[PDB]
Write a protein that binds this ligand. Structure first.
Ligand SMILES: *[C@@H]1O[C@H](CO)[C@@H](O[C@@H]2O[C@H](CO)[C@@H](O)[C@H](O)[C@H]2NC(C)=O)[C@H](O)[C@H]1NC(C)=O
Ligand SMILES: *[C@@H]1O[C@H](CO)[C@@H](O)[C@H](O)[C@H]1NC(C)=O
Length: 237
């Protein structure tokens, strides 16, 4: 399985170290991203859903599509062959493609192909007793594991911010509510058509992107929402 690194490994971006299986670089800013899909709606009525996990450069630029030799068109088959049946079921529910389950496969391919291949600490050479595409399955499990710790809907709700046909909301309230689950660092807050739509939670990493310690870090992009008037549309309305 993946190599392990010391829990006092140096923090990506925040320190100056050499890329290795125990140092995420140049992709040292890891973004756990989420969606609020209301039209069409997906996922539970009271949960956001997974967009992905992206390695950005420390300056906010990013690499994409970093390894054509490890791009795939069969993520669902890879997960089944690895017996990750509960992970796959969870993905269908919490990492949906909005268009429908039949588009889930292409969405997951996109996320692995585009972004997973750019996570340097995930490469096969970072494994003991590697088996073909082990890191692909490991990556999907890690996204889910991080997502589970970032329950945006509850954090918002606890701050009095719940989807509504009529209520509208202030950016800074949205930001503060979400910062409370992220060590005081707000996520990127993305709106569409004046509706709350996307979140990026930024982290730096001690050790490997699989299994290392994810440390809440400062957002490298703030928001494209207006300061107020933000709609939080109810799902399945
Ligand atoms: C998913 O697709 C990949 C890419 O084709 C499969 O891995 C290849 O398997 C072929 C045919 O068995 C091997 O000869 C190649 O060497 C493999 N390529 C790599 C990069 O490993 C993989 O087996 C597929 N997985 C499942 C479960 O269907
Ligand atoms: C999945 O189970 C099959 C059949 O038991 C086994 O051959 C295979 O090695 C397993 N793979 C993993 C990753 O657990």
């Amino acid at each position: 399985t993946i190599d392990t690194c010391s829990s006092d490994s140096p923090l990506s971006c925040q320190t100056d170290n050499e890329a290795s299986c125990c140092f995420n670089s140049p992709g040292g800013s890891l973004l756990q991203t989420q969606f609020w899909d209301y039209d069409p709606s997906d996922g539970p009525s009271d949960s956001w859903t997974i967009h992905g996990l992206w390695p950005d450069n420390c300056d906010g630029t990013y690499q994409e599509y970093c390894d054509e030799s490890r791009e795939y068109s069969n993520i669902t088959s890879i997960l089944e062959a690895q017996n990750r049946t509960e992970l796959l079921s969870y993905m269908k529910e919490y990492w949906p493609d909005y268009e429908g389950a039949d588009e889930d496969e292409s969405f997951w391919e996109h996320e692995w192909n585009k972004h997973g291949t750019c996570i340097n600490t995930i490469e096969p050479s970072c494994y003991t007793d590697y088996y073909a595409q082990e890191e692909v399955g490991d990556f999907f499990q890690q996204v889910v594991d991080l997502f589970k710790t970032l329950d945006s809907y509850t954090a918002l709700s606890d701050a009095g911010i719940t989807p509504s046909e009529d209520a509208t909301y202030k950016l800074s309230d949205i930001e503060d509510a979400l910062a409370a689950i992220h060590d005081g660092y707000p996520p990127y807050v993305g709106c569409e058509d004046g509706a709350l739509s996307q979140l990026y939670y930024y982290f730096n990493v001690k050790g490997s992107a699989i299994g290392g310690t994810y440390v809440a870090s400062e957002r490298l992009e703030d928001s494209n929402c207006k300061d107020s008037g933000i709609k939080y549309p109810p799902k399945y309305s």
